[PDB]
Write a protein that binds this ligand. Structure first.
Ligand SMILES: [Cl-]
Ligand SMILES: [Cu+2]
Ligand SMILES: [Zn+2]
Length: 155
């Protein structure tokens, strides 16, 4: 089987929630990521795929950012990045982040497959590895998880 579409329902302990859609018509092509997230503070919020689709214990059970190539944290456009580094979503004045992303590193098939893994929206902006500290090189200093969910097959 080869997934062409995926979906992730994001939920948390507070007001943050949303639906994220993934589309990839070609196995060797980019993934379109689109949807909306509500209940956010206005501004930038870190947006990452973590390694495991698990919250057995909590944040640790989702593991670090998905990182099959053993690289350091960066932005989605950087050559040096984790596969799960999708950068930041932007929330407007009403707390709605309209997500519109095209990425060529994540995939719905193969070694970079994100199906069965966890998508997370964070409290703070992702510094893209440019924060000048150790945490920047791992998480981008995006802080706590406001909402998460496991990425499932949709088509
Ligand atoms: Cl760029
Ligand atoms: Cu994260
Ligand atoms: Zn990362």
């Amino acid at each position: 089987f080869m997934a062409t579409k995926a979906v992730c329902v994001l939920k948390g302990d507070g007001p943050v929630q949303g639906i994220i859609n993934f589309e990839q018509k070609e196995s060797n092509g980019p993934v379109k990521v689109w949807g909306s997230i509500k209940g956010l503070t206005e501004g930038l919020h870190g947006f990452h795929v973590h390694e495991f689709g698990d919250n057995t214990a909590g944040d640790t059970s989702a593991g670090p950012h998905f990182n099959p190539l053993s690289r350091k944290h960066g932005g989605p456009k950087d050559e040096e990045r984790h596969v799960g580094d999708l950068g930041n979503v932007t929330a407007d004045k009403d707390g709605v982040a309209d997500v519109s992303i095209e990425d060529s590193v994540i995939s719905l098939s193969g070694d970079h497959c994100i199906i069965g893994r966890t998508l997370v929206v964070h409290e703070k902006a992702d510094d893209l590895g440019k924060g000048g500290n150790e945490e920047s090189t791992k998480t981008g200093n995006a802080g706590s998880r406001l909402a998460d969910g496991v990425i499932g097959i949709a088509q």
